[PDB]
Each structure stands twice: as structure tokens, then as C-alpha cells.
Amino acid sequence: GHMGNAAAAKKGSEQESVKEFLAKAKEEFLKKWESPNTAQLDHFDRIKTLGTGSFGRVMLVKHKETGNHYAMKILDKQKVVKLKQIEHTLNEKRILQAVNFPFLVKLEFSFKDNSNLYMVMEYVPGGEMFSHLRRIGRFSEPHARFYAAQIVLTFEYLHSLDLIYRDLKPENLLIDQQGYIQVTDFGFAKRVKGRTWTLCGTPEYLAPEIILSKGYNKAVDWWALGVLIYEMAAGYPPFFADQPIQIYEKIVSGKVRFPSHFSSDLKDLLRNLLQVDLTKRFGNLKNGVNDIKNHKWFATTDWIAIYQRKVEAPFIPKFKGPGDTSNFDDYEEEEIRVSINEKCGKEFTEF
């Protein structure tokens, strides 16, 4: 076979240890999920906007009492107007307050006022993978593989808890002071036992079954991993067009072309992740995540060493001190106005 006796026994034992880990992780998650206003706005100085979206922004803030820096996501309650926008915001807070994994951002506080919802997370100063990737062009395969391995382990963890992530992309992956990944933005994450039906995500990263309005499962995350690995290694994603409608047509076609510099091992992995037929997509078969972890492209990956953060990272972001924002792009700054009248109080009672 491909493995000798010693290698096969080591791999098997490793897989049983994964099961043991995930069983304990589920017990810990459920405790926080079943039995979870830990601060207020004037406890922080607002420093700089780190990113912006349709419903709000993320700001670097400094806790007045302790001097610790944090990333504060601010959502305008009125802007959270559409039905699925509201439910998704409750998903995000509840999931972040219950998960625990080395590559998932840690939530520290959450609260709300008359106008906004707030989630205060650890500040990850190394910037988004997105801007490093756009600046360098593309990552070499070993560099892309180091990041991909962290996503594989993170999705193995999330999916074991029946959590789908649903917004993988370089914009949502921050690089920490040791060069490892922190997944942020859980706005589209959801606990799903089987199928779900919401049309959501980012166009370039949508699996065909989402676009086709089919009920779908956690395999959409494995498709998105294929898109991410391709984009990291090529510098652009596999389904690339100026308008969403054209992107969708490419995704559903079932056709992918690869740069001539992609290794054959990489192309094989990507053909099995970017698989329109769900009965054939890696991550969705009887062997689950192990079809990915045991693929030849990952043969050099020490999964436990990655989890334990023992592997030397390919890139360490420069940091000039606490509160440094040099690894983030600049954004238009807008005052945080809080109305004297409570908005949407009933819609956000649970937050």
C-alpha cells in the first residue's frame, strides 16, 4: 500500500486521538452554548477604523481601565433590517461566545445600546491575509499549505460542533504576531444539523448548490477551501469576473483551469474540493476530513504541530508596539452617534 505498517498504525492512532479531542471539545462547547452585557461603550477609547461593511465597521479601541487594545465590531441595529440579517447577528454572537480554538478569534465583550450592537474581540495586529496576498501577488505552495492546514483543522473543529462557517475568504483571515491565522467574522456561521437554505456568502466563494437554491450542508465550506487554496496559490480565485452574475455562471459550469505553475498534487486536491457533484466532493465522503488531511499535497504537514503552533511560520508581520495599525488599510472615519431613543429593541432582545 501507500503506507507501511509503522506509518499506518501511527495514522490510525492519530485519527482516534482526533475523535477523543473532538468529543471533549463538543462537551465544552455545549456548556457555553446552553448557558453563556459585559461592558459599555464609554469604557473604550476609539482609535481607528480597521474595516467596513454594509452593516457597520470594525474599530481598534483601547480599554480605558486596563489599556488593552481590542477590535470592536459595531453594527447599526436599523441597518440590520433584513430578516436574515437579524438572525445572522444573533448566530454570530452566540457562536463566538461558545467556541474555543487556536485559530478562531476570541470574543471578550458584547453589549448593545439604543442604536448599535457591539462585539469586542482580541486585536490581531498583523493585518488581513487579503492585503498581504494582494501585495505579494501569490503565495508559494508551502506558504499556502501552512495557512490551508489551519483552515482544515478549524473546519474540522467547527463541523464537529454542527457549525457551518459560510464566509471563508482572505478578507476574513487575520495574521497574528506568530504568523498564524485568526478567523474572524462569524456573521454567516450557523448551527446546522443537516441542511440549511439561506442564500448567503461571498460570490467568488459560493458553492454551486448555494447558487442553485438547493438546500445545502457543511460541504459548502470544503468547496470554499478549494477556492481559498486556489486564490492563495494563484493570486486570483478560480471563478473570476467583474459582476456576480458572471461569477455564478462560471461556478455552476463545472469547469476550472489552473496556472501552469500549480503542482499536479495541488491540481488533484483542488479538482476534488471544487467538485460540483456532492457524492464526490472531498470533505463530504465516508472518510470525511481525512480525505483532505491524507491527500498527497498535505503529505509534509504535521497536523498536531500546526495545532500546537510548533511550525515556523513562513511570514511574521512587523509590529511596532501595542496598538500599531500599520498592517491595515485606511478607511473613512465616521462619528459613532447614539440616538436618544431605543431602536429595534424587541428585535434584539436576545443579544
Partner: peptide
């Protein structure tokens, strides 16, 4: 190969 090079916004219901 024309496509979107800037930050990409997620879509909520379409």
C-alpha cells in the same frame, strides 16, 4: 482575465 481585485462584500439574501 477581468475580475474583482478589491475587498469583496458578502451577500445576505441573493
Amino acid at each position: 482575465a477581468a475580475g474583482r481585485t478589491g475587498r469583496r462584500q458578502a451577500i445576505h439574501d441573493i
